[PDB]
Structure 1
Amino acid sequence: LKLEADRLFDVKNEDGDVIGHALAMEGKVMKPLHVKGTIDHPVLSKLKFTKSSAYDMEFAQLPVNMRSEAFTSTSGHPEGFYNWHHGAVQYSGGRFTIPRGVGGRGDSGRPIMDNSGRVVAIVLGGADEGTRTALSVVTWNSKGKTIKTTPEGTEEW
């Protein structure tokens, strides 16, 4: 059996469709800015969100309590395979890549993470490079600063 904390939340549209996800990580609730909807959570949906347009990110501070049920980011990540909801992701030459036909609407927001459980990046969109989809993500470098990879022809999910 799998018992996993309160970290990934649904973001629904007007009639209720899941159009994206929001995550608890490093003391903040966060979600892609382009995802226009409401976080499906009684406490989280009422918080005041700060807009970070240069990274397609929108974040608010995790309530003192929820602070323990949260992910953790990680700077150092070599090439190789990673994990995500739909299976194995793939860091290769500075860009993550998943098979064609896997990514789609509602997949923006979910984390890509290692085997140790640290979040490497968060998904935003994808540009199809023939047989694999290159991912557009918010990732982070050695001295903290977050980077924002965006492939050519990326259509945000």
Structure 2
Amino acid sequence: ALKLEADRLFDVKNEDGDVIGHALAMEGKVMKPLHVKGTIDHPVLSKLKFTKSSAYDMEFAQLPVNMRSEAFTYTSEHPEGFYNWHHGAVQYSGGRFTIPRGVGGRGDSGRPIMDNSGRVVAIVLGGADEGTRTALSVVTWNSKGKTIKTTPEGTEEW
């Protein structure tokens, strides 16, 4: 098994170039957290017209007809249990996505949370530490395609 995958996740860098977040190709759009102020490290995508959505901390542009195939697929069905992401397992329980305390932070915004079949279940924006864990502030859509934004008490944007 070699992890040969398309180009879907892109870096968003700051003025000096630090990676402060992530942008993703999904369901025909390039999307990144609105609070993430930087540029998308991509010669084509950094030149697109991004539409803003303050209510959900989302910014998005339409994917170039070409790239539209190199993208993630969303899913609105998330039974409880364990999910995958860049740093490991993500536990979904009580309608909340949690990761161990001291794992998430700056740079992790824009990152997706996947299921085993490789579908996106959510997009990380920030987290609120609660005891031994951290409750994530994510964006998720429902079965009727409606965007929903869950933000725990005292969530710090990553």
TM-score with structure 1 setting the length: 0.99
3-state SS of the aligned residue for 1:54? coil
3-state SS of the aligned residue for 1:55? coil
Aligned to 1:77: 78
Which residues of 2 match residues 110-129 of structure 1 at below 5 A?
110-129=111-130
3-state SS of the aligned residue for 2:124? strand
Alpha-carbon distance between aligned partners in 2 of 1:14 and 1:144, rounded to the nearest angstrom: 35
Give the deviation of 1:2 after TM superposition. 1.1
Give the deviation of 1:142 after TM superposition. 2.0
Give the deviation of 1:143 after TM superposition. 1.5
Unaligned runs of 5+ in 2: none
3-state SS of the aligned residue for 2:46? helix
Cα deviation per residue 1:35-55 (whole Å; 9 max; x = unaligned)? 000000000000000000000
3-state SS of the aligned residue for 2:79? coil
Alpha-carbon distance between aligned partners in 1 of 2:72 and 2:40, rounded to the nearest angstrom: 18
Give the deviation of 1:98 after TM superposition. 0.2
Alpha-carbon distance between aligned partners in 2 of 1:27 and 1:2, rounded to the nearest angstrom: 23
Alpha-carbon distance between aligned partners in 2 of 1:91 and 1:49, rounded to the nearest angstrom: 31
Q: Give me the CA root mean square deviation.
A: 0.5
Aligned to 1:96: 97
Cα deviation per residue 1:92-139 (whole Å; 9 max; x = unaligned)? 010000000100000000100100111000000000001100000001
Percent sequence identity is 99
Misfit runs of 4+, over 4 Å: none
Aligned to 2:152: 151
3-state SS of the aligned residue for 2:55? helix
Unaligned runs of 5+ in 1: none
